[PDB]
Amino acid sequence: DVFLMIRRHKTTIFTDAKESSTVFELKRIVEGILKRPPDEQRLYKDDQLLDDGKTLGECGFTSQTARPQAPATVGLAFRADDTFEALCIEPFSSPPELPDVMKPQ
Amino acid sequence: MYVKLISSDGHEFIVKREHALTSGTIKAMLSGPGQFAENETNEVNFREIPSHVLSKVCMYFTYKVRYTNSSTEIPEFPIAPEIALELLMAANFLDC
Amino acid sequence: LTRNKGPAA
Amino acid sequence: WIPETLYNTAISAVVDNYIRSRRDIRSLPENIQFDVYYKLYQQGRLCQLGSEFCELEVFAKVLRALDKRHLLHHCFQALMDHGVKVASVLAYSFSRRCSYIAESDAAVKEKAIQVGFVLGGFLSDAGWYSDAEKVFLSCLQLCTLHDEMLHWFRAVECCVRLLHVRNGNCKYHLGEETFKLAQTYMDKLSKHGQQANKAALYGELCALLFAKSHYDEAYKWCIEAMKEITAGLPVKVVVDVLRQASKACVVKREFKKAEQLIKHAVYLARDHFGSKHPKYSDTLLDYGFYLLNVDNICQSVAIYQAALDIRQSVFGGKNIHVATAHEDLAYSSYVHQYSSGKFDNALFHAERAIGIITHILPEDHLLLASSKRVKALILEEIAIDCHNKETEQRLLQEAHDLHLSSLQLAKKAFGEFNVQTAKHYGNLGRLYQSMRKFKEAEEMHIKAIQIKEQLLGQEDYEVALSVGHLASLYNYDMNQYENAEKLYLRSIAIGKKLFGEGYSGLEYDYRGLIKLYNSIGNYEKVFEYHNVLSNWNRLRDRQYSVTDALEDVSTSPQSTEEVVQSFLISQ
Amino acid sequence: AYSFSRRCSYIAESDAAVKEKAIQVGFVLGGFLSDAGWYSDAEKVFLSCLQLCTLHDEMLHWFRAVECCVRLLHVRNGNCKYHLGEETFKLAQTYM
Amino acid sequence: TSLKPRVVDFDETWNKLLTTIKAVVMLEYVERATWNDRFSDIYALCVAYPEPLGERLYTETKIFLENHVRHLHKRVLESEEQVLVMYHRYWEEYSKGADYMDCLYRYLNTQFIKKNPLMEIGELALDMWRKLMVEPLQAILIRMLLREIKNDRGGEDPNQKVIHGVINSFVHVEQYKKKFPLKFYQEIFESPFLTETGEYYKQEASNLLQESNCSQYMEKVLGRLKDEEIRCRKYLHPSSYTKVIHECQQRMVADHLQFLHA
């Protein structure tokens, strides 16, 4: 059982899937959520594309690095006029950086 | 079965509806005039909660739903030291 | 038990 | 197992980087700050918690959480056991801010009083009357300046509380002038076309005069307090007035009239406050007082132990309220097990009370004298029930030291012609009878009888006990049988008139009377007193079938108006 | 002990340098708490060091893990936890 | 911004809140984004700096609910001879509005009302309906409610939902009275109804014996009791299934007990 975050720009999908599940099943999930056919989607893991026939465990999504308390980011892009934009995962807001207590004045 | 938890920065965390109803406040937001969103997912606006805090809240939702009533040993939720203060006010406000 | 108890606390 | 709440997880994660967020926790919502500080207490970080609870900036936001106040009463206690003098530091901080704010407008000063009222009420609830009195004195000083009606109302509301904190600290001499000042403000407020509900003030004065052993004045003022109970009064005030009026009725030999008062007080406390509240514990403690003074001791222990368990779970360890519950339960277990000799539990509670009081109160305090006297009473009967004479001469010497300390404290504070010093003299007479000092025992018992007959009528419970003690000294030891005969007869008359034929001390009185008439030659009277004693034992065995006192009140027995009106029409 | 056990989990997924720094800090703290006699409060530190030692397959991490199991055997003998000590020794023999 | 205690002005925040609160109590269309923003407004009021405006917000909500229920009370008394229908129509809207406003006031309920004699906003609205709408209508409403159920016993066919909705409104108010949920209902309507249905089965019982013989008396008993059973399924509360079906026996079967021995 593997937990992911599909991060099409500002959207974030907290879906769950099995390791034995294929990438095309994940695209079907995104189809069920974003109403986009699987041919329109291109999934990216760490700026590396995922083949449709590859299983989720094949691409590097194990239940040890994509646990529910820290899911693994999975990029996604949508086809725009017979093309495909690059991944544009916008970063989350930077937390207020707490200063180190041992930093000298 | 999916709800779009829009954050203050415009981030749209699409989480499963069963997951989001863990928190009492989102359950209250999705009850009444807030459930009139006919367009599939119910967009919940969170103009106070930032994206980095709402993301950890959604991760807590999918963590508590998965790890509920489980006989196995349960790891604690990882909360960063710099985010604990902001997540604490969002945990009170959301009643999660 | 030649006596009674004590008065008050 | 169920997953831990994100609230609790974030609390655990904000405590851990405590230095990186110490100044940011104070900016949290007021119901998260207390949860963070309770996590500091739970984690054992009492040293980091003391540095935060000692600031009135931080403690004010903690006192406004009322659901989780019973938690705070534990945390605030733990620091006072940790060695952090949180109560005195908070009182000093409040006095300093009052000194700095006294030269300001009445709008801001009223907010400082309201912070003062809740803080002083917390310190008096927790038992720190010596430190709650400083806060209430500062509030009274704030109210004294402006002479408008609101300031007079706040001043009388702080003098009905200043009287309470000067009664738990045993400062009745200051309590009299505090009540005089409250009466002055009440008269001034009445002269301005407004009436203040003088129920709490009169109840506190009843408690003062009963603690000062002025049972006639205490009864008069409790009647005047119960006259002023209305429907709009807070439940705390109604409960306090009912409780103090019950104690006054009990000590004025009105057991049939105090029963309804104390049962309704216990019902009110268990209804509003709950079964685990310190006010419910106070009502249980004085219900046990009533039951102990109506010869219902066999279940009185079941009520003090219920009262102690509530106080020991809310107020932690070394607290004066736990100490009072211990010294009260130690005396009941002394009485309940007087015929059994198993005073190991009674002594355990008695030395626990002194162990608490000597830590938190000075050696020159009245409330230490009552704890010492209970342990001294328990040490008397343990000494006369052991076998080694070295123990019989060491335990009795310790009891002598304790009784002399109690007598000198009660004589310094109350005086020489009071009832507490009279019963101290009676206890000294009992102890000297145990120590084979028969002449001095006779002198002490004569002094006790003289003082109690001078004040407490002639057919009262206390004078009956003192007469029984002197008569047992004359009969069993001094062999002055003709003198002991009349005293046994008077003790029987008082015991039958007050408690009927089920009085527990009637056993000792009948046994002494049997030996009295056996050693003089009235043998047919000795036989008739054997059959009278057998009838008494059968009657007590029949009377043993009494249900627990926490089930007598049942659910919704009466209401406040009915009980108050019944007491009022019953003289 | 609780602070170290909570703080090590947040960097157990980080690089090996900070993991080794945390392992050294845990060795120092657990050695102090074993010397002082808080074996139950030193078992947590050594257990946390063990989870830091069992995420990467390497020679020095095996050395650190067997040292963790040697020191964790000492805090379980002093705490009279003998039904866990045999398991700890078996795990140490496995890593050795 | 942030979920931090910040100094706020209660006037404009309360006005913005009150607009949507009126829009939701009487069930108008309020935007979902506005509804989700009102939760932030509630939170900001409840943790406001330096003093939490929980008591002020609670008092203002109580004042608004009192004013609104009094307005509905005057508006339902204005429609003479249509009190029951108008009361039911406004009661459905007010019940939905009270539930939705309980949802909106979830932070006030969990963090102030429970923390500090105080009623939750969802169960305060029902209490205001009880002691400001039902209690003033304790006479006029129960008169039409009892006289009309008697009318349809003869053969009339009135509106089903208005009769059951009003009768069930006596129990729906007492959700928060967990000690005795049926205490109010059994006194406002049932104890007048049992007497009324006893009279209808005592006055007509003599009329029933007047024109009927003994042989057909046994069969016609089940005919009338079945109709009361149908009305029990239809108009009465589910908790009043056994009481009315047992009261009619004591007023009709026991009235002619000697006749039924045969």
Curated annotation (Swiss-Prot), chain A:
One of its GO terms (cellular component) is cytosol. PROSITE patterns: UBIQUITIN_2. GO terms for molecular function: transcription corepressor binding; ubiquitin protein ligase binding. The modification Phosphothreonine is found at T83. Keywords: Acetylation, Host-virus interaction, Nucleus, Phosphoprotein, Transcription, Transcription regulation, Ubl conjugation pathway. Residues 1-65 form the Ubiquitin-like domain. Pathway: Protein modification; protein ubiquitination. It is found in: Nucleus. The keyword Oxidoreductase does not apply. Its main location: nucleus. InterPro entries: ELOB, Ubiquitin-like_dom, Ubiquitin-like_domsf. GO terms for biological process: positive regulation of proteasomal ubiquitin-dependent protein catabolic process; protein ubiquitination; protein-containing complex assembly; target-directed miRNA degradation; transcription elongation by RNA polymerase II; transcription initiation at RNA polymerase II promoter. CDD domains: Ubl_ElonginB (cd01788). Pfam families: ubiquitin. Belongs to the Elongin B family. Heterotrimer of an A (ELOA, ELOA2 or ELOA3P), ELOB and ELOC subunit. The elongin BC complex interacts with EPOP; leading to recruit the elongin BC complex to Polycomb group (PcG) target genes, thereby restricting excessive activity of the PRC2/EED-EZH2 complex. (Microbial infection) Following infection by HIV-1 virus, component of a cullin-5-RING E3 ubiquitin-protein ligase complex (ECS complex) hijacked by the HIV-1 Vif protein. This is Elongin-B. It comes from Homo sapiens. The gene is ELOB.
UniProtKB/Swiss-Prot annotation, chain B:
Pfam families: Skp1_POZ (PF03931). The keyword DNA-binding does not apply. GO terms for cellular component: Cul2-RING ubiquitin ligase complex; Cul5-RING ubiquitin ligase complex; cytosol; elongin complex; nucleoplasm. The keyword Ubl conjugation applies. Keywords: Host-virus interaction, Nucleus, Transcription, Transcription regulation, Ubl conjugation, Ubl conjugation pathway. It is found in: Nucleus. Overexpressed in prostate cancer cell line PC-3 and breast cancer cell line SK-BR-3. Ubiquitinated by the DCX(AMBRA1) complex, leading to its degradation by the proteasome. Heterotrimer of an A (ELOA, ELOA2 or ELOA3P), ELOB and ELOC subunit. The elongin BC complex interacts with EPOP; leading to recruit the elongin BC complex to Polycomb group (PcG) target genes, thereby restricting excessive activity of the PRC2/EED-EZH2 complex. (Microbial infection) Interacts with HIV-1 Vif; forming an active cullin-5-RING E3 ubiquitin-protein ligase complex (ECS complex). PANTHER family: ELONGIN-C (PTHR20648). Belongs to the SKP1 family. This is Elongin-C. It comes from Homo sapiens. The gene is ELOC.
UniProtKB/Swiss-Prot annotation, chain E:
It is found in: Nucleus; Cytoplasm, Cytoskeleton; Membrane. It comes from the Eukaryota. Rapidly degraded by the proteasome upon overexpression of a C-terminal fragment of APP. TPR repeats lie at residues 23-56. Disulfide bonds: none annotated. Substrate-recognition component of a Cul2-RING (CRL2) E3 ubiquitin-protein ligase complex of the DesCEND (destruction via C-end degrons) pathway, which recognizes a C-degron located at the extreme C terminus of target proteins, leading to their ubiquitination and degradation. The C-degron recognized by the DesCEND pathway is usually a motif of less than ten residues and can be present in full-length proteins, truncated proteins or proteolytically cleaved forms. Component of a CRL2 E3 ubiquitin-protein ligase complex, also named ECS (Elongin BC-CUL2/5-SOCS-box protein) complex, composed of CUL2, Elongin BC (ELOB and ELOC), RBX1 and substrate-specific adapter APPBP2. Interacts with APP; APP interaction inhibits the E3 ubiquitin-protein ligase activity of the CRL2(APPBP2) complex. This is Amyloid protein-binding protein 2. It comes from Homo sapiens. The gene is APPBP2. The chain holds residues 98 to 193 of 585 of the full protein.
Curated annotation (Swiss-Prot), chain F:
It comes from the Eukaryota. Neddylated; which enhances the ubiquitination activity of ECS (Elongin BC-CUL2/5-SOCS-box protein) E3 ubiquitin-protein ligase complexes. Neddylation leads to structural rearrangment in the complex that allows interaction between the E2 ubiquitin-conjugating enzyme and the acceptor ubiquitin. CBC(VHL) complex formation seems to promote neddylation. Deneddylated via its interaction with the COP9 signalosome (CSN) complex. It is found in: Nucleus. Core component of multiple cullin-RING-based ECS (ElonginB/C-CUL2/5-SOCS-box protein) E3 ubiquitin-protein ligase complexes, which mediate the ubiquitination of target proteins. CUL2 serves as a rigid scaffold in the complex and may contribute to catalysis through positioning of the substrate and the E2 ubiquitin-conjugating enzyme. The E3 ubiquitin-protein ligase activity of the complex is dependent on the neddylation of the cullin subunit and is inhibited by the association of the deneddylated cullin subunit with TIP120A/CAND1. The Cullin neddylation domain restrains the RING domain of RBX1 in the E3 ubiquitin-protein ligase complex; this restraint is removed upon neddylation of the cullin. Belongs to the cullin family. This is Cullin-2. It comes from Homo sapiens. The gene is CUL2. The chain holds residues 2 to 280 of 745 of the full protein.
